[PDB]
């Protein structure tokens, strides 16, 4: 099917505590494969997936160079942001960057991304057409005019449609045995009385990859959207993911409720009933 590559970086300023903390990570789909942490001892881009370990010394040399140069770029951007927003240099602020591309089943380019957030909210982002920018406020409009003048978008468009998807297609090949997998969820139900008249029904999905999944509760064939507790999809730590969805049900009426599970790894969607 389709695949994605994302790089994220996070810069956090810490006045009177040194340079901003800088953490960068790289993913293919839901699989992390590199990281850099300014507080780590190596001061190197490091491997975090087996299939990237095969890259030569030059790869790590160049990746380290770019990511370290980026930490300094976003370091200055944090300072620039202070000016734009007229904020004191006593406060701690955050700058997040995301970049990457999507490809379809055929390996063809599908989508490119390049966007920033300041203190947890949109700052600037490359529009889907890869030719124009979305600025979130008056400060980002300043940056937008700068990037328009410098033709940043045409540079990044070429890179996203070329180098990025080229790199992604390569990683997908190198990590073929693991990255192309689709582990179906193993499903089960738990049931716990909470009083003399109500019971909890919890629908579980475990051991699945990729993380994308849909759990839905129905009562007599109707979505129970408003009464269901859904937890965020979570990593098992072994490369797979977990999720559950629960509903509180009148005792003796369990059989009216059905849990529906949808996932890329299933031949057909599953239905669970207590």
């Amino acid at each position: 099917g389709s695949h994605s590559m994302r790089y994220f970086s996070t810069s956090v300023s810490r006045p009177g505590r040194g340079e901003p903390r800088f953490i960068a990570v790289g993913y293919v789909d839901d699989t992390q494969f590199v990281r850099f942490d300014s507080d780590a001892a190596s001061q190197r881009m490091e491997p975090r997936a087996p299939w990237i370990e095969q890259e030569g010394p030059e790869y790590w040399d160049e990746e380290t160079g770019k990511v370290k140069a980026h930490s300094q770029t976003d370091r200055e951007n944090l300072r620039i942001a202070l000016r734009y927003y007229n904020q004191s240099e006593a406060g701690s602020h955050t700058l997040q960057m995301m970049f990457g591309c999507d490809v379809g089943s055929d390996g063809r380019f599908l989508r490119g991304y390049h966007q920033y957030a300041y203190d947890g909210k949109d700052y600037i982002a490359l529009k889907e057409d890869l030719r124009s920018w979305t600025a979130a406020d008056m400060a980002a409009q300043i940056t937008k005019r700068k990037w328009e003048a410098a033709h940043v978008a045409e540079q990044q468009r070429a890179y996203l449609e070329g180098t990025c998807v080229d790199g992604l297609r390569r990683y997908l090949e190198n990590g073929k045995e693991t990255l192309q997998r689709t582990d179906p969820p193993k499903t089960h139900m738990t049931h716990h009385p909470i009083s003399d008249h109500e019971a909890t029904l919890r629908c579980w999905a475990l051991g699945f990859y990729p993380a994308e999944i849909t759990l839905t509760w129905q009562r007599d064939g109707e979505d129970q959207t408003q009464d269901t507790e859904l937890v965020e999809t979570r990593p098992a730590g072994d490369g797979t993911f977990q999720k559950w969805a629960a509903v509180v049900v009148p005792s003796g009426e369990e059989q009216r409720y059905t849990c529906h599970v949808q996932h890329e790894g299933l031949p057909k969607p599953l239905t669970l009933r207590w």
């Binding site: 770019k66 980026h70 700068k146």
Partner: peptide, 10 residues
């Protein structure tokens, strides 16, 4: 591969 970000100055 990590992007080329020299030009990403605010």
């Amino acid at each position: 591969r990590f992007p080329l970000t020299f030009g990403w100055c605010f």
